[PDB]
Structures are given as C-alpha cells and as structure tokens.
Amino acid sequence: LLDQTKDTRITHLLRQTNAFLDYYNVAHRIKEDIKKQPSILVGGTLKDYQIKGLQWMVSLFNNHLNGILADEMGLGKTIQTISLLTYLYEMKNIRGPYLVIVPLSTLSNWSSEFAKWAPTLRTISFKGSPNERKAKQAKIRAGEFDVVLTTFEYIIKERALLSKVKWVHMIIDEGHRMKNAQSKLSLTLNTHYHADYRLILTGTPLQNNLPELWALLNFVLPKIFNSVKSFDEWFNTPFDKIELSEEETLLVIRRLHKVLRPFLLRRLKKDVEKELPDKVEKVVKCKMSALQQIMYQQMLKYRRLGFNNQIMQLKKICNHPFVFEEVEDQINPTRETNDDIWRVAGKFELLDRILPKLKATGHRVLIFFQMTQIMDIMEDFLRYINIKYLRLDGHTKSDERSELLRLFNAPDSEYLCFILSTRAGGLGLNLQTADTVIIFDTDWNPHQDLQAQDRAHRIGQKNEVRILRLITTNSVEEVILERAYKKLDIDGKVIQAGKFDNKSTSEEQEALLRSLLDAEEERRKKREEELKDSEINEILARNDEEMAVLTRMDEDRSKKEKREESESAAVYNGR
Amino acid sequence: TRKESYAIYVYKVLKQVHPDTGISSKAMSIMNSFVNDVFERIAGEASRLAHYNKRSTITSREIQTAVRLLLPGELAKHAVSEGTKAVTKYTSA
Amino acid sequence: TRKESYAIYVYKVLKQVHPDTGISSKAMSIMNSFVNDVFERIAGEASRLAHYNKRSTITSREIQTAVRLLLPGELAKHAVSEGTKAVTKYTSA
Amino acid sequence: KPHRYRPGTVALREIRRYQKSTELLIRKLPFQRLVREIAQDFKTDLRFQSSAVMALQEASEAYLVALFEDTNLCAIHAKRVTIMPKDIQLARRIRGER
Amino acid sequence: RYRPGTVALREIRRYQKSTELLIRKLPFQRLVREIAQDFKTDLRFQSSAVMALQEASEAYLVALFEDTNLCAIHAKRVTIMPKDIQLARRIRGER
Amino acid sequence: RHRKVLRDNIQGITKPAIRRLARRGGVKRISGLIYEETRGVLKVFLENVIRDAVTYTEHAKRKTVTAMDVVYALKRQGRTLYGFGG
Amino acid sequence: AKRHRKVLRDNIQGITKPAIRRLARRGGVKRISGLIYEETRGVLKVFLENVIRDAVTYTEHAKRKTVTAMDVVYALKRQGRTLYGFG
Amino acid sequence: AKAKTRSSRAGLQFPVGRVHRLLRKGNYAERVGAGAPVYLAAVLEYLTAEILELAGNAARDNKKTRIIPRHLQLAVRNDEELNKLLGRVTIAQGGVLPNIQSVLLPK
Amino acid sequence: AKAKTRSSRAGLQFPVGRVHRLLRKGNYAERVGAGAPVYLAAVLEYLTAEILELAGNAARDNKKTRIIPRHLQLAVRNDEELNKLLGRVTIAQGGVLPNIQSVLLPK
DNA sequence: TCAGGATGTATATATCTGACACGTGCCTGGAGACTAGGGAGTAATCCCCTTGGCGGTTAAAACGCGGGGGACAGCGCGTACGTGCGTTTAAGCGGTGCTAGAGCTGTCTACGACCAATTGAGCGGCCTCGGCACCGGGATTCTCGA
DNA sequence: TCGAGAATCCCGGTGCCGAGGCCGCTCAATTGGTCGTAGACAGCTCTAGCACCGCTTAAACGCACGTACGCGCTGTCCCCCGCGTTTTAACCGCCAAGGGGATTACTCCCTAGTCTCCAGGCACGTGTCAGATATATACATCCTGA
Ligand SMILES: Nc1ncnc2c1ncn2[C@@H]1O[C@H](COP(=O)(O)OP(=O)(O)O)[C@@H](O)[C@H]1O
Ligand code: BEF
Numbered sequence A: 001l002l003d004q005t006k007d008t009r010i011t012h013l014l015r016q017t018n019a020f021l022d023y024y025n026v027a028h029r030i031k032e033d034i035k036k037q038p039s040i041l042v043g044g045t046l047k048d049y050q051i052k053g054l055q056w057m058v059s060l061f062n063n064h065l066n067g068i069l070a071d072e073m074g075l076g077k078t079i080q081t082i083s084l085l086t087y088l089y090e091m092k093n094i095r096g097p098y099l100v101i102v103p104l105s106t107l108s109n110w111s112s113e114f115a116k117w118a119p120t121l122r123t124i125s126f127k128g129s130p131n132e133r134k135a136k137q138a139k140i141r142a143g144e145f146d147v148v149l150t151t152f153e154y155i156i157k158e159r160a161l162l163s164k165v166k167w168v169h170m171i172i173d174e175g176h177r178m179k180n181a182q183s184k185l186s187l188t189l190n191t192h193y194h195a196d197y198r199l200i201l202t203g204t205p206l207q208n209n210l211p212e213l214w215a216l217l218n219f220v221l222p223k224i225f226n227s228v229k230s231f232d233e234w235f236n237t238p239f240d241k242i243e244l245s246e247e248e249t250l251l252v253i254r255r256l257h258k259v260l261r262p263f264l265l266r267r268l269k270k271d272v273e274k275e276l277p278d279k280v281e282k283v284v285k286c287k288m289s290a291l292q293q294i295m296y297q298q299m300l301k302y303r304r305l306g307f308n309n310q311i312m313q314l315k316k317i318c319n320h321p322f323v324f325e326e327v328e329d330q331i332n333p334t335r336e337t338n339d340d341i342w343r344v345a346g347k348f349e350l351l352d353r354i355l356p357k358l359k360a361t362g363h364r365v366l367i368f369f370q371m372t373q374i375m376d377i378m379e380d381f382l383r384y385i386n387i388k389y390l391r392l393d394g395h396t397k398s399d400e401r402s403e404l405l406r407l408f409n410a411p412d413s414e415y416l417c418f419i420l421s422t423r424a425g426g427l428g429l430n431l432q433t434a435d436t437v438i439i440f441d442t443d444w445n446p447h448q449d450l451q452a453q454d455r456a457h458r459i460g461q462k463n464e465v466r467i468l469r470l471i472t473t474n475s476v477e478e479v480i481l482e483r484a485y486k487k488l489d490i491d492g493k494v495i496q497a498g499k500f501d502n503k504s505t506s507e508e509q510e511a512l513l514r515s516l517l518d519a520e521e522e523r524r525k526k527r528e529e530e531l532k533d534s535e536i537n538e539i540l541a542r543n544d545e546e547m548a549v550l551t552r553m554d555e556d557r558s559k560k561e562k563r564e565e566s567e568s569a570a571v572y573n574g575r
Numbered sequence B, C: 001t002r003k004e005s006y007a008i009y010v011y012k013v014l015k016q017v018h019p020d021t022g023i024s025s026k027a028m029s030i031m032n033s034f035v036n037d038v039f040e041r042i043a044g045e046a047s048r049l050a051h052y053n054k055r056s057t058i059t060s061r062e063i064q065t066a067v068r069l070l071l072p073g074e075l076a077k078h079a080v081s082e083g084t085k086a087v088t089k090y091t092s093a
Numbered sequence D: 001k002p003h004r005y006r007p008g009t010v011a012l013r014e015i016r017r018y019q020k021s022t023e024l025l026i027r028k029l030p031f032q033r034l035v036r037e038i039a040q041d042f043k044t045d046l047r048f049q050s051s052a053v054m055a056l057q058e059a060s061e062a063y064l065v066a067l068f069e070d071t072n073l074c075a076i077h078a079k080r081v082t083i084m085p086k087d088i089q090l091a092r093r094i095r096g097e098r
Numbered sequence E: 001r002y003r004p005g006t007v008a009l010r011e012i013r014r015y016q017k018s019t020e021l022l023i024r025k026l027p028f029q030r031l032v033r034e035i036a037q038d039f040k041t042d043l044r045f046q047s048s049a050v051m052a053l054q055e056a057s058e059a060y061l062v063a064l065f066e067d068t069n070l071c072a073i074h075a076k077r078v079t080i081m082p083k084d085i086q087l088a089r090r091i092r093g094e095r
Numbered sequence F: 001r002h003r004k005v006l007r008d009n010i011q012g013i014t015k016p017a018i019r020r021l022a023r024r025g026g027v028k029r030i031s032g033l034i035y036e037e038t039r040g041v042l043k044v045f046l047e048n049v050i051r052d053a054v055t056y057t058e059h060a061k062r063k064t065v066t067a068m069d070v071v072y073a074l075k076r077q078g079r080t081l082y083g084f085g086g
Numbered sequence G: 001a002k003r004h005r006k007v008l009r010d011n012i013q014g015i016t017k018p019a020i021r022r023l024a025r026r027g028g029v030k031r032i033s034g035l036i037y038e039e040t041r042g043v044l045k046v047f048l049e050n051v052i053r054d055a056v057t058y059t060e061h062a063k064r065k066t067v068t069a070m071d072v073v074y075a076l077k078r079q080g081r082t083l084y085g086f087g
Numbered sequence H, I: 001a002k003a004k005t006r007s008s009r010a011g012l013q014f015p016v017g018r019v020h021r022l023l024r025k026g027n028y029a030e031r032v033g034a035g036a037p038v039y040l041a042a043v044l045e046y047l048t049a050e051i052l053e054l055a056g057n058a059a060r061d062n063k064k065t066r067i068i069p070r071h072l073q074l075a076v077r078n079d080e081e082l083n084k085l086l087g088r089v090t091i092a093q094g095g096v097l098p099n100i101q102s103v104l105l106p107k
Numbered sequence J: 001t002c003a004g005g006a007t008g009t010a011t012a013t014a015t016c017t018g019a020c021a022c023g024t025g026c027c028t029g030g031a032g033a034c035t036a037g038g039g040a041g042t043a044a045t046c047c048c049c050t051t052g053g054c055g056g057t058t059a060a061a062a063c064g065c066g067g068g069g070g071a072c073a074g075c076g077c078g079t080a081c082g083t084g085c086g087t088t089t090a091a092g093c094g095g096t097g098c099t100a101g102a103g104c105t106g107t108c109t110a111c112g113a114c115c116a117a118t119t120g121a122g123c124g125g126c127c128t129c130g131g132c133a134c135c136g137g138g139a140t141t142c143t144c145g146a
Numbered sequence K: 001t002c003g004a005g006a007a008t009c010c011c012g013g014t015g016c017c018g019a020g021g022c023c024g025c026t027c028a029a030t031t032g033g034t035c036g037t038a039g040a041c042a043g044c045t046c047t048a049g050c051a052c053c054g055c056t057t058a059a060a061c062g063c064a065c066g067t068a069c070g071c072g073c074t075g076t077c078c079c080c081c082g083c084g085t086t087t088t089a090a091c092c093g094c095c096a097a098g099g100g101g102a103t104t105a106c107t108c109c110c111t112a113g114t115c116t117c118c119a120g121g122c123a124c125g126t127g128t129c130a131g132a133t134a135t136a137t138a139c140a141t142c143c144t145g146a
C-alpha cells in the first residue's frame, strides 16, 4: 500500500542519517547502552527510565536524528536534558552553543536544577526589563557562554539579536504549544536560524482532531514535509463499530503504528516505580440552585439576546453568580462576606462540606480554574474561610511566581490550599507535598485537564492521592464532560494508540484491544446526593482511622447544635 | 396640453383635516413641489437600495427601509405604521 | 467569483505618466473608489438631464453638459476638449 | 532647575509631529468597544467586519479633526488662543449640525 | 429722540413680521441680466425666473446674516464686521 | 433691437436695502464696511446659480432661461427651492 | 477593587484625555481648555449614533447580521461625508 | 366586470395608479413591485397630513381662514422634526421665525 | 472578420465596453447612445491622469518611488481645482495639509 | 420708582374686488382579463471570518506638583454709527406696440435594441525580488538661560 | 549676545513582504445581422418677452449731531502645561468553536406585458366673499424729566 514508506523510507533512514544529518535496528543502527551516570551529575539518583530513554535519544543523535518525548508526566525531562547535554558534551566537550526555550512558568526552576544538578555548564536567561536584557545582551552578546536559556516570545522580539548566530542542537519544552506551523512561533523558528538537531518535550501528543500531526512530523524529521497535503481523509478515517474501527481504525492505525514505532517514547509510573498510591482518579456530582436553573429552562433572555455565546454565558453561570455587579446589587447590597455565597451553588455548598475534612486531615489541596474571574470570588470565599491560600494566576507578575514557589516548598507551610491557572499549569510547578487535587469548570481540551491532573502523584510522593471533579447534574457542564471523554474515545484510537509504542512490543497492543476495548465497551454500557457524611467520608478517607477522625466533623454540618432574585434578574436581565 | 399636479389630492386631505380652511393658490403650488420632491427622495433611495443588493425589483420592503432612512425619528415610526396598515388593508380585498 | 475593478487601467495611465512610479495597493484601492464615484456623479447628472427634457436617450451631448456642471472651471474646459477629440477620432474610423 | 522649555514650545513641536504622519490617533480597542456599545441599542447581536470598525474610526477621526480646525478659527477670531466649549458649540451651530 | 438702538429693535420686529421682498426689483433684474451677459449672450428671462433668483438670494443673505450675527455676539461685540462674515463663509466651507 | 452693455449695476443693491436684510436676520448694529463685502458675496452667488441655469438652457436648444432651470440650479447646489415648480 | 473588581469604568471614557488632545494637536489647536473633553465625547457619541444607525438599517435590509465595510461606506456616502478606500 | 379604484381598495387619497406610473416611467428600477405604489402613496398622504394640520393650526392662531405661505413657513420651522427634514429648503414668500438675540434687548 | 477593441479605435485606456455595460445596466436611461461610452471614458481617463500626475510629483518630492495615500491627500488638497471637486471627501489614511495659524507662532 | 406725552401699535367698521371653490363637457390614462417566463424564494452545503478568552510585554495613561501665561475684569478714550431732516430720484404702475421663439404637430429614418457565433482581455493563482521600514550611530541644528 | 543641550536630519547597512511580472482559464466583449421607434427636422401658431413712454411718490441720499460702543490698556488671579513617577490596559501572540456568509439547484408565481373599455380628472367657465384697504378710536410703551 504505502509500503514505499517502509522500504523507501528505511533507505531514506540511511538517507537522513548518513547523507543528510523491524525498525529497532536500521533507524537505530548505531547502538549503545550505559547505566553509569555522567560525572557532572551532582546529588542524583538513576531510575531506569531516563537511562533507556537516555541512550535511546542519545542513540538518535548518534544516528543524527531527532524525536519527540511522549512520556506521561513527572518523568523528569529536566534530568534527561541535563544528562543529555552534560553527557554528550562531557564526551565531545564542544559544549555549545545550544539553547532551550521553556515555559515562562518554569524558568527559575530550570535555573534551580541547573544550580544543584550540575555546576559545570552555566547558562544565561532573559527576564524583566529590556534594560536588564540590555546588560546581559551586550555583556554576553559577544557569545561567551555554555547555553542560551530563553522563553517563548523573547526569541521573537530578540530574534534580531540572537538569530545571527549559528546553531546545531535545539530543545523546546511543552511541545503542544507548537501545533500549527502557521502559528507565529514556529515559522519564526524556521526563518530564525538553523539547528541541525531538535526535540519536543511534552506530556501528550496532539489534539483529538489530529490534522497537524503532519506539522509535528514536519518538525520532527524530513519524512513527510513534501507530500503533506494528501493523507487527510485517509488518516482522519478513525474520526458497525467492528467494521468501521476494523477497516478504518485497524487498517490505517496499524499502518501508523508500524510507522510510529521509531518516534514517541512513554511509559507509566508503575513501570518505573509502582509507588503510585492508587489509580487516584475519581469524580463526584452536584446540583445547582434552581434560581438560575429556571433560566436554563426558559432561556428567553439567553437565546435571542448584551448577551452572546450563551454557552460561555452558561459556563459563567454554571460556576457561580456575582460575575456582574447587579447580582450583588439586588442580591447582596453590601457585598460583605455573606450567606448564599456558599448556598448559591453546589460547588460552594459541598465545598463548605469538604472544608472541615480538608483542614481536618490536613492533606493539602490544589484548585484549578479555566477562567480567571472565578478565582476572585474564590479568594473572597477563603477570606471568609480564613484558612490561608496563595493566589497564582497567569500574568500576575514575573518573579513572585518563584517567590511563591519558595513559600510553598517550605515543609512548614500553614496554608494548605492555593490556586493555579490551567493554561499556565504547563508544568508550572513541581509538588511533592500534597495529595488532593480538585479541578473545576470545563477545559475544552483534556490534554490540559490531564496535564494539571497529574501534578499530584510525583516522584517521591509519600502521600496517597485523591482527586475529584466538581460538576453539577442537569446542566450543560456535564454535557461537556460527556463530550470530553467522548474525546477520550477519540484519542483512545489516537494517543492511546500512540502511547504504548516504545520498544515495539508484540501482545501489549492486543492487551489494550481486549482490556481497553472492555473499557470503551464499558462506557458504551454507561451511555447505552452525597450530603450525608458517610459517602464523602468513604470516597475521601483512605483508612478506617481517617473515617474515625472525621467523626469530630459530625458535630456541625450534620449535628448543628430565592424567587425574588430571579424576578430581579428576569426584569433587569429582561433587556 | 395638460400639466398634471397633485392639487386636488392635497385639497381633499385638507378637507379631511380642517373642514373650514381654504388654501391659497400659491400655497397649493408649494405643497405640490413638496410632494414631488419628497417622492423623488424616497424613490431615489429605494432605487439604489434595490441596486446595492443587486435585486432588480423595487418592492414594499425597500420603500419601508428608505422611509426609515429619510424621515427623522417619530415621522419614521408613524409613517411606517401608515404604510404597513395601508398595504395590509390593500391585500385584504 | 471575480470582483472586477479599474486597477490595471489606472496602472497603464500611470505608466504613461511617470514611467518609474509604482503605486501601492492601498492607493490603487483609493483611485478605484474614486473612478467609480466620479462615474456615478456624471451618469447621474446625464440621467436626470435626459429626464428634464423628456428625452429617452443619454447621448454624447448630455455627458458633455453634465461634465460642464460638475467639474469646476479649467477641468471643465480641458475635459470637454479630451472628450470631443476622443469622440471625433472614434468616428473617423 | 532641569532644562525646561517655555510653555507652548512642546505644543508646536507636537503639531509638526502629528501633522506630519498618518497614524490613527485613537487606540483601537477603546474605540471598538465604543462602537459595539452604541450598536447594542438599535439591533442586537450584530457582528462587525473588522474592516468596518476601521471605517468608522477613520471617518470619526477625520470629522473631529475638521471640527477642531474650525473651532480653532473661532477661538483665534475671539483673540483667545484656547478653544473652549462655547467655541465648539458655535462651530456646530454654524455648520448647521444642530 | 429715541436712544440709539430702539429704532433698530422696532425695525427688527417690523421686518421679521412680514414676507415682503426686501430688494427693489429693477435694480436686481438689471443685476442678473448683467451677470448673465458673460456666459451666453442674448438670453431672455421669464420674469418668474428673475423672481426665483430674487427669492433665493434674499434667503441666502438672510441666513448669512443670522450666522454672522452669531459670530459677532460670540466675540462680545454687537456690530457685525467684515471679518465676521469672512469667518462665517470660511466655516460653512464656501471658500 | 439693441442691447446696452451694462456695468456698475451691482450698485443697484443699495445700503438701505442691505440694512433691511440685516435687520431681518436679527443683526442689531451694522458696521460701515459690510456693504462692499456683501455686494461681493451676492455677486459670487448669482455667478454660480446663473452659470448653471445658463448651462441647462444651452443644453435644451433654447435661448430662454426659465424658472424650471433656475429651480434646478438651486436644487443642484444643495439649496432646494419650492413654489415655482419642479 | 481587589476582592470584587468593580473597576468597570465605561466605554466612552475609552477615548481619553491625551487621545483627544492628540486629535486637537493634529487640528492645529495650540492650547486646549479643560472642559473640552466631556464636550468632545458628546460630539463623538452623536456622530456615531447617526452613522451607525444608518449602517445598521442597511444591514437589516439585506437580512445579514454582519455589518460590513461597504455598508458603513454607504451610510457615510449618504450623509455627505463620502469615504474612500474601502470599496 | 365592475371597476374599483386602487385608492379606494387602499383607503388612501393619493392616486395610487399615478404613483405606479411615475415609478415605472421614471427609470428607478426595471420592475416595480405591486405593493410599492400603495405603500409609498400612504407615506406621502401621512406627511402632507402633518404639514397641513400644523399649518392650519397656525393660520387659526392668526385668525385667518386660509393657509398662506407664511403659515407653511411657521408650521415647518416650529416643528423640530420637519425642520430637520426640510432644513435645506427655501420656501417662497417665506419670512422668518421671529427671532431676537438675548444681548440686543435693553437692560 | 477580424476584431478590434473600441478602446483601441478610440485611443483611450479605459475599457469603453465596460462603461457601456454599466450605463446600460445601471438604469440611467432606457437607451444609451453609441458615443456616450467613448466620451465618458475619455473624461475619466483625463481626471485620473491629473490626480496621478500630481500625486507622482508629490511622492518624488518626498523621494519615495511609489504613491501612497498621503500623497493623494497632498496632491488633492494642494491643487485648488480638485479641492473644489473633492471637497466633501474623506480619504483613508489621509493626514492633513501641514497648517499652522499665524497667531500661534512665537514673537 | 412715578409721571406727561408723543409715538407707534393694535381695535372696531364700512367697502371692493379679484382669488377661490364649484359645476359642466371631454377624453386619455387607469382598471380588468389573460399569458409567459424569469427573477426571487428556499433548500442544501461548506468554510472562513467572527467572537470570546488568556498569557505576556511595554508604551501609554493617570497622578500630581509647580509656575508661567493667559482669560477675564474694569476703565478711559474718540470715532465710527444711528437718527432725524430736507431734498432728489429712480422705482413702480399703467399703458402701448412689436415679434422671436416656445411650443406644438406631421414626416421619415438613421439608429440603437436585441439575439446568435466566436475568442482573447482580463482575472486569480503563483513566483519572486527591491523599496522601504528600521536601527543605529553620527553630525548638525533650534530653544533656551547668564 | 555666547554655550548647552535636547530635538531632528542624514548614511549606511539589513531584511522582508508587498508590488509586479507571469501563466492558464474563462466569460464578457466583439462581430454581424435585422427591425421598431425616438428623435430629427420642417412647418405652423400665438404668447409672453422686450422696449418704450408718461405719470406718481416712496425711498434713497447727503448731512449734521450726538453718543455709546470698539478698542487699547493694565492688573490679577487662576489653571493648563511641562516634567517626572507609578500603574494598567492596549497590543500581539496564542488558543478554540460555530455561525452566518457565502455559494449552488430547483421551482413557482408575480409582473411585465398586451387588449379592451370607461370614468376620474382636467380645461374652462362662473358666482361670491375673505382679506385687503380706508377712517376713526383706544392704548401700551419708551423717553425724559423728577
Ligand atoms: N533520578 C531521580 N531521583 C529523584 N527524583 C527524581 C529523579 N528523576 C526525577 N525525579 C523527580 O522529578 C521531578 C522533576 O521532574 P520534571 O523534570 O519536572 O519532570 P518533566 O520535566 O518530565 O515534567 C523532581 O521533583 C524529582 O523529585
Ligand atoms: F515537570 Be515534571 F511533571 F515534575
């Protein structure tokens, strides 16, 4: 069929490797493995994952070939990049110039690991004023350095400055920022300079839609950049389940496996450790006060009316009112910390419910948000709760991100919770000190949902992770949840097709056929409150003694010693 | 040769407004040149509206629009009322 | 669908004026909307001149007149010259 | 004291500066939110081609510019150099815009 | 003898009351014929026409003096002056 | 059978008349220089209107300006005139 | 403020003091009085009410919900302000 | 085959037929709709009704039985709406609204 | 039966044919004369020749090779004739003639 | 503030007459019946241009402080303007007589509207490089004090 | 009237993307007939325009005098500019979704015809009264004195 890809592109493997600069051999032809860490590494431990992946990517450089790292999360891409350059240029000693471009959330982090996890290879950063960037730009302008460290846009702005210099091996992080080649960053990189080597570090493959997997594999290697246009309706065929999935997904997806073997690299935590405390993934449900539910039924303010993107309007009122001054005006005239703040929604009511257990067992918590404003009312809500929290969000400031990181990493931290921004989640921190993670809202793409989802269980996690999603029943938001794991079925034939291919196994893929297909069939079965402390205690408390220490919380929320506002929003939202 | 005008019509409407009042010849001339004028404005607008959409046909809906462009405010509202009512009653029979 | 314009024509005349000069896209848009505009003024005048005399036919003589109404002074004189000459040379062959 | 021009010289230096160039003098997003607001009242849920909003901006800036040339003529007429509200309200009263 | 300015107001009421044409005919008609000599020659005017010109022109000058008056009052003078007019025409855009 | 070639007839507009007009417009106290200016203004205005009228006339193969033609010249410049027809 | 925003100002305050002041500076104005600002917001808001009113009308006539460029060009072309360059 | 006039069917006093003739033979568009004459005629009726009504009221306030150009002048210039409509118009025999500026009156 | 374009016969650069089409299908009059397209096209040619010529001169005086809206603005507003013609027009990207009143300059 | 008095303004009463409101005969433009066909209405379809929001940066906006320049208030002067009068004249109103041309009708006829055959002028996509933005550094100038 | 110093032009190098030149694909412009009609032109009236004159007088003109307003001046107080510093919202780059703006195909009924009557609306008389127009009377109103 496309077998000219197999034979022609294996001889073309010879072409890239030698000429340009069972696939386990010919593409990998130059072989080696070493368990002995590089001499520059200071104060570190070797698990086997960054070893196997280590000499696999290092093998790709010996093959003079690039790749993508598809691995899960928490696998320490930092350390693989450190062992990467420190080992390569511990050998070659050439040591430069080479640059990495990392998320603005993680910068002083990278500077930290570069501090304690290797002294010999130093770098240079870009932050703050164009004045400080003047000092280091003219200072080290002359090109005396080991490595360039930058961030996303400063390569665009500084591009005039730092583009005039030659490059060989470049590294990016959070590759899913790339996506389109028409996105400005990519095409700048192309016009920017030329480095013979590249890489992509990420926590997931491309979007469910997967048009741009073309673009990726353009940026990965010479392979497909000539013929790009044609394959669309063939490869998209995965997007008579036996016949449809059989012809479409089994034929072409098998094809792509046989293509995708020498690219992506991944495993799970149980592979490297088994220290993962549990599957540590659960959810819950809720219900919203009918006050605004009546508005969902009628929607005669919503449909023809100034309002717009009424879905976005929903997600705004799905979460919580007080987004608009009048809510507080005809509702809470003094905007003081007040009741019906927590009684308006189920997230705030059952959130009150989980509070005493929160502080009770003291296990810490992360709360994430898709949209900004909500964190404000949440902050006021903690201002009533009085148990302290950090507020982190995009664009807040520059280096107080780092300062807050320090405030967290202190083992004595009294404030248990604090807030992040999903879009800025982006590996923006490392957390070993907490267990519980709570997500809100919608997150139209799961890759970020799972992205923040995985911050909890971390290498060296001594706690046992519990996770819950806050969704209210009988609402558009659980509809979008539906659509979300619908896209878990979409990528289940894509990124669950792309994930398991590392050493090019044999029967594991049919293990995912039978057992995974039992999972998709299980949600086919699926398609076609907890107010009592008993339930929530059970799902949360991780041992019977934890169940017992929650009896001290039975003395208040259990023991314990409307329409007007909708006529106000109907008249005054009656425009 | 007969030179037509709107005289007698204006005169009727007058009699349905102020049964007493007479209207001097000069004033009748003015009201004449008026009605011709306003007519040219409206049919002008309806014309090049029929043009900007590349329709070939002046219809009621244009005339309604053009009337809503020329006449300020209240005259627009009432005039639209008069028109709509009149057309309706025209179609009834 | 093709949206016609006067671009290439303006460009020719340019080349017969300033052989060097190029003309940016935006400027070409302006000159376009210009020529369409002036055209609408002139054919407008020639229209309702053909109307006030109850002729049914726009002819050269109207266009000459309308040109003498719109264009101030010297533009009127020269423009009339251009026209007359052009028509003449048209009839010669 | 630091080097300080007499009042009025910074002014002229501006006037040359701006009358030299073509830039749009009103920052976009304020203006676009302005237009959308004003259009809420007539019909609802309109969508503007960005080229349109550019059109409004260009017109309106040309209108206000004309208005200030004329107002300036009035203020100079009164032997003041400082335009004032009654100067404007005059200018619009003369053009016939009221 | 009235104080200066009272005869003025008494006029202003008088004229703003009535409709009469304010320019004696034959001067105006000879004016028009003169101005028309230059364009074509040997024209004949329907007297109704000359009436038309007179009515227009008087309405134009009347407007012009209302506006000029607005300017003179603006300057805190009561007496219209040439630069007042030349202003008014400069604002309307007639130059 | 003859045509006297005219001059200095704009003097036909006389200081008393212009004082009447100015009175109608609400002007209170006229300066003494307004007169020469006004004669300038008027002469401009009539120059335009009469040249357009004459144009229409030339077009229709007539030697006779007519009220219709003036009314069209005024409608043309943007000052509409009512009562004389058209 | 911090807790709840309540920082919504207004749209028409979007045109600012120094912006208006720049417009004047292009006009030739030398020294601007302090009251002119609220005024010029007045003028501007009127002008926009007119033009936009007409453009909206044209649009509703064609059954489009998209106010285009050709339409604004027509509204202005109607009030006598004719604009060039947009088609 | 009895005849009944389109004005009568309409309930209007303007000659719908005559309008339709004008719209056709003025070269406004190629094809004139069937409702357009009716609608337009209605409009013209309305406007003339306004101007006449106001005028008559004015003449009555001058105790004249008939409407004369002065009364059209006043009925048009007092009403602010029509004033906005007719603002460019010079009415024959017009006169002016009686108007006197503030500063001119004696102390 | 060899073909030759009416522009060529005319000696003009505007597409006489296209003009004739517009005059017919715009409903200006019922019947368009045969000379009218030619004559009109000649006129348009002349005017565009003027504006372009002046503009080019202006750009050359700014030492720019190409004509940009600013140069149309200046070529139109300096020429007094066209200024009279275009006086109601708002040119995009326009700018203004550099203008400073007498009294503003220092002593 | 109060008054005499002249001045112009508005009030009541005959009268005069030409403009209007109406009645009649006449005839052309409207109305009604009938036919076709093409333009507009509506369904189907798809993709791009719009909208909404967030991150991240930095140039502009807001704030405020001082001080120099100008708006405004009053005063004094003298000259240009209004008012009243007597005098002159050109407008106005009415007649007369002439006739140039505005305006209509009766001929034909060049000529412009169609309609069918035919093809290249112009249009959209797509290369592809130089004019212009633009930075940077240098030199030259224009507005302030001592 | 000489320095300082903050703008502003100028030379040179860089890069980059928008003008411009090039090619194949149409459809709109030619050609070339025919045929119905506006209009071109001659021929007639008969009307309103021009020219002139004579007679009346309301208005325009020249002038004299008094006066109040235009205008220059000075002072004074305040408020808008220029500058620096802290803040924030615009701006450019992302991310997404979905909905109106496009097209195309098909149908159906509305309107342009066309022919046949026929009464509304127009020219033209005709009587009669609403508003000038004229005399006489009463009264507000401004000016100047007090
Ligand atoms: N060999 C190791 N020994 C101890 N901890 C490790 C090791 N490798 C990784 N980690 C843990 O991984 C974390 C850093 O992971 P990170 O580089 O952020 O992962 P990724 O880059 O894959 O998202 C550190 O907190 C560290 O505790
Ligand atoms: F960035 Be890894 F998830 F700690």
Ligand SMILES: [Mg+2]
Residues within 6 Å of the ligand: A077, A078, A173, A174, A201, A202, A427
């Ligand atoms: Mg990473």
